[PDB]
Structure formats: C-alpha cells, structure tokens
Amino acid sequence: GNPLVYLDVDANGKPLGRVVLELKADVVPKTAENFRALCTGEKGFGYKGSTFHRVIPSFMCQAGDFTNHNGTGGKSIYGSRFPDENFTLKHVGPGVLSMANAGPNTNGSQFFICTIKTDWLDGKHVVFGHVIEGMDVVKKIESFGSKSGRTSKKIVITDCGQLS
Numbered sequence: 001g002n003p004l005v006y007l008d009v010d011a012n013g014k015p016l017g018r019v020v021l022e023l024k025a026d027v028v029p030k031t032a033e034n035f036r037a038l039c040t041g042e043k044g045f046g047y048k049g050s051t052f053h054r055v056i057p058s059f060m061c062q063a064g065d066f067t068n069h070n071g072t073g074g075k076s077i078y079g080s081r082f083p084d085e086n087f088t089l090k091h092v093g094p095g096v097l098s099m100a101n102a103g104p105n106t107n108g109s110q111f112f113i114c115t116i117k118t119d120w121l122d123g124k125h126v127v128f129g130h131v132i133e134g135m136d137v138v139k140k141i142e143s144f145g146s147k148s149g150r151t152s153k154k155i156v157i158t159d160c161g162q163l164s
C-alpha cells in the first residue's frame with residue numbers, strides 16, 4: 001500500500017522529534033514516489049540535511065529546497081520539474097502534505113505541511129499525503145516561524161526515510 005515515511009527534525013541542532021507521513025500513492029503515484037525517494041535518498045540526493053526555510057504561523061511549514069535552502073532551488077527525481085498530477089485530494093485541514101510550486105506544472109522537491117485548512121490552494125497545489133504522527137512536532141516547527149516566513153532558529157531535517 002501507501003508509503004509511510006518520516007522526517008526527524010531539529011532546531012539549531014536540538015531534536016524536536018519525528019513527523020510521520022502517509023503518501024497517497026493510490027491517488028498520486030508519481031508525486032508520492034518523488035517524495036518517497038527524496039526521503040530515502042536512493043537517487044543520490046534528497047531531503048536529509050536540508051531545512052524548513054519558510055514557516056508561517058497559522059498557515060504552513062515549507063521545506064524541500066535541498067540545493068539553495070531558500071525557496072529558489074530543489075529538483076525532482078524525474079528532472080527539474082514535473083507536471084501537476086491531479087487535484088483530487090483537497091487541503092482539508094491541518095496536517096495536509098502538499099507540493100509547493102511556482103505556477104502550473106512546476107513541481108520539484110519543495111513541499112509544505114499545513115497547520116490550518118488551506119482550501120484556497122485547492123486545484124493549484126497537488127496534495128499527496130498527510131501527517132500520521134507528529135503533528136506536535138509540526139507545531140513546534142510552526143513556533144519557530146514568523147509572519148514573514150523567516151525562521152528564528154535553523155530548522156533541519158536531520159534524518160529521513162521510509163518505514164513501510
């Protein structure tokens with residue numbers, strides 16, 4: 001079935017705990033597979049050692065720019081970008097896992113975890129999973145954000161991978 005993956009996150013080198021995510025390979029197989037492989041690092045690149053670079057309280061926590069660490073970089077396992085797979089899954093509340101983008105058909109590696117319902121993003125960002133465990137960890141990350149998106153501590157995915 002659907003991959004279960006994890007992200008172990010610290011703040012200025014101090015551990016905050018584990019976020020566990022289900023990836024909806026049953027609905028968005030290509031988008032799910034991208035994220036799964038970037039978690040395991042099996043392609044020779046991925047999320048381990050990269051940051052949450054944009055975190056906005058009462059909105060979302062954004063990560064996945066593992067090349068430039070600021071929203072301008074990242075890439076997929078397929079190439080620099082890939083199409084919007086479908087918009088079947090909606091931004092229904094906190095804990096939704098969704099692709100960041102720069103417009104239609106610009107998915108790379110950047111993603112976000114929602115800390116509120118973000119339904120104004122429906123049909124524009126490809127939702128591909130949700131938090132199974134560690135919404136308290138997400139809330140810790142959210143606490144180091146700001147209204148600008150800048151983080152007040154360096155928030156690092158110290159490890160990541162696939163549980164099943």
Ligand SMILES: CCOC(=O)CNC(=O)NCc1cccc(-c2ccncc2N)c1
Binds near residue numbers: 081
């Ligand atoms: C709530 C989520 O909000 C957003 O998605 C706001 N947008 C955003 O953060 N865009 C940066 C970005 C996001 C994703 C991919 C790129 C990209 C960069 C350079 N070359 C190719 C690319 N595919 C850039």
Ligand SMILES: [K+]
């Ligand atoms: K706002």
